Design an enzyme around this catalytic site. Sequence first.
Site, mmCIF file in Angstrom:
data_model
loop_
_atom_site.group_PDB
_atom_site.id
_atom_site.type_symbol
_atom_site.label_atom_id
_atom_site.label_comp_id
_atom_site.label_asym_id
_atom_site.label_seq_id
_atom_site.Cartn_x
_atom_site.Cartn_y
_atom_site.Cartn_z
ATOM 1 N N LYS A 77 -23.015 -14.056 -35.949
ATOM 2 C CA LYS A 77 -22.064 -13.251 -35.180
ATOM 3 C C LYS A 77 -22.799 -12.083 -34.518
ATOM 4 O O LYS A 77 -23.949 -12.245 -34.104
ATOM 5 C CB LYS A 77 -20.883 -12.808 -36.054
ATOM 6 C CG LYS A 77 -20.192 -13.971 -36.761
ATOM 7 C CD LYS A 77 -18.805 -13.604 -37.253
ATOM 8 C CE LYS A 77 -18.146 -14.784 -37.948
ATOM 9 N NZ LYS A 77 -16.753 -14.518 -38.412
ATOM 10 N N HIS A 90 -15.126 -20.575 -30.747
ATOM 11 C CA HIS A 90 -14.939 -19.800 -31.968
ATOM 12 C C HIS A 90 -13.673 -18.938 -31.864
ATOM 13 O O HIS A 90 -13.378 -18.377 -30.802
ATOM 14 C CB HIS A 90 -16.159 -18.931 -32.268
ATOM 15 C CG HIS A 90 -16.207 -18.426 -33.675
ATOM 16 N ND1 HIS A 90 -15.580 -17.267 -34.076
ATOM 17 C CD2 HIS A 90 -16.817 -18.921 -34.777
ATOM 18 C CE1 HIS A 90 -15.795 -17.072 -35.365
ATOM 19 N NE2 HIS A 90 -16.552 -18.058 -35.811
ATOM 20 N N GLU A 143 -11.782 -24.264 -38.479
ATOM 21 C CA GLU A 143 -11.769 -22.906 -39.029
ATOM 22 C C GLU A 143 -10.333 -22.401 -39.132
ATOM 23 O O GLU A 143 -9.806 -21.791 -38.192
ATOM 24 C CB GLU A 143 -12.668 -21.920 -38.258
ATOM 25 C CG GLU A 143 -12.921 -22.203 -36.791
ATOM 26 C CD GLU A 143 -13.449 -20.978 -36.058
ATOM 27 O OE1 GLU A 143 -13.064 -20.775 -34.897
ATOM 28 O OE2 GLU A 143 -14.226 -20.198 -36.647
ATOM 29 N N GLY A 167 -20.141 -17.681 -41.743
ATOM 30 C CA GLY A 167 -20.202 -16.345 -41.152
ATOM 31 C C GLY A 167 -21.022 -15.353 -41.963
ATOM 32 O O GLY A 167 -22.236 -15.496 -42.070
#
EC number: 5.3.1.1
Lengths: 238, 235
Positions: A10, A93, A163, A222
Site C-alpha cells: 500500500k 483494489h 476482498e 496488506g
Amino acid sequence: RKYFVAANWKCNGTLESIKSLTNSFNNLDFDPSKLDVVVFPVSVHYDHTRKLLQSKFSTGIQNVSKFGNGSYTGEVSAEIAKDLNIEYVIIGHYERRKYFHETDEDVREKLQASLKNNLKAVVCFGESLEQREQNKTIEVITKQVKAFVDLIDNFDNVILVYEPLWTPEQAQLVHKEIRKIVKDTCGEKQANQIRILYGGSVNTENCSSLIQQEDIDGFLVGNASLKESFVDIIKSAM
Amino acid sequence: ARKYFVAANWKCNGTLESIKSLTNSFNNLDFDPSKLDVVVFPVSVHYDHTRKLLQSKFSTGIQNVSKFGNGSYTGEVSAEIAKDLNIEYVIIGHYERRKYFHETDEDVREKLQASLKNNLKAVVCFGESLEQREQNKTIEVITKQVAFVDNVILVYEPLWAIGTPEQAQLVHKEIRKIVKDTCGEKQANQIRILYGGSVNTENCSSLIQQEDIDGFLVGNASLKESFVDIIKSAM
C-alpha cells in the site's frame, strides 16, 4: 493449482525500511515452483525494490492506467509497465474503488490494457459490510466479476482476489461460487487453473485455515506483508 | 524581475530507451542556473531512471501526489515517501486529473498541505473553463481558486482555450494581484507564475517576454529534443 502469495505494501515504506524488509524476505528459502510470490511496492519504490529482492520474487505495481500512452498526467500506462518489465499489476483494489471512484468498467479497461501488453493482472473485487448484511455478497461479486469475466485469459496472467470488507467455511463457499462464475465463461480447464485469492485482512492467524480450503489459492496481504513474519504467510502456502 | 522556471510535463509517455536519448540531449544544454530552474516530471515508475540519467543541474519531480499521508491508500504516493526519496517537486491540480480522475479544488488543497508539510515544492495548476471565461468571470474564478494561498509555483492552465500572449499576460497579472492582496507585494513579486496552456518552439519567446509570465509547464513539446530551445528562450 499453483498457490500465490502477494504483498500489497500500500502507501508505506522508506528506502531504509525496504532495505531491511527485502533482506528478511531474501533470507527465506522460498520455493518459486510451488508458489508465486509477488511484492507490490509503491510506484516510486519499484526500481529500488526490484533491485534488492532476489529474482525468485516477482514484482508489480499497485495500479495501472485505463488509458494507453498520451496526455494523462499522473498515470502509468500498461505499455510503460511492459517496457519496464513490471510483471504484475493490482487492479480494482477496494481503496481505489472507494477513495478514487474506480468503476467496474475502469477495472475492465485496466485489465484489457494490462493483458494486451503482456502484464499479469491481480484483479480485486468484494462486497461491503452493509452488502453482506443485506445478503448481497454474491449479487455484488457477480456484478463485479461479470464486468470483466469475458476478458479473463489464463492461469498465468489473471489472478482473482476476493476482498470482503468484513468463517473460513463461509469464505470457501464464496470462492466456490466465484470459480463457477469464471467457469461459465472460461471453462473447467481455465477455471480449475486460475487462482482465486483471499484478500480480506490476511494475517499469520487465518492464513493456515484459509489456504487449506478447496477454492482458496493464496492471499493478497496488506499490513501483514510489511512485517518480517510475512515469510510465515508465504510458508503457509509452500 | 523573477528567476524563470521551465518544466517538462512528459505526462504518460516514454520508454527507458527514449528517455536515455532525450536526457542525453538535455544534458548537453549549458544553461545559467541563476537565470532559471529547469524541472523534468517523468512518470512515477520512470523517476529513478530519469533522475539517474539527468545531470544535477536539472531538478526532478512527480506528476501527482497523494491527498493522504502514509497508510492504506493502495496505488498512491505520499508526500512523505517523496521527501524520503528526495523528490523536489510535485505537480498538483493538472486539468487532466480534474477531467479524468475526479479531482476537485478540495483535493488540490489537501495535496498542497501534504506537500508543504513535508518540504516539497508544489507546482499548482488552476484555470477557468470556457463557460466561466465567456461570462467574463475569470477574475472571480482565479481569485477563489488562488482556496490554496494561505516553495510554491503557480500555473495558469487556460482550460477555456482549451490550449494569445496578451490574453495570458492579463490573467497572470490578475493572479499576481491576488497573491499581493493576501501575501503582500514582496511575496507576490517573488512567486513564479507559469503559463501552462500549449507551449512550443513557435510561441515560447512571445510568452516568456510578457511581464507576468515567468516560465512554462510544457506538455507534448517537452518529449522532443527541441525542449532545450524552449529552455533557451527563457535565458
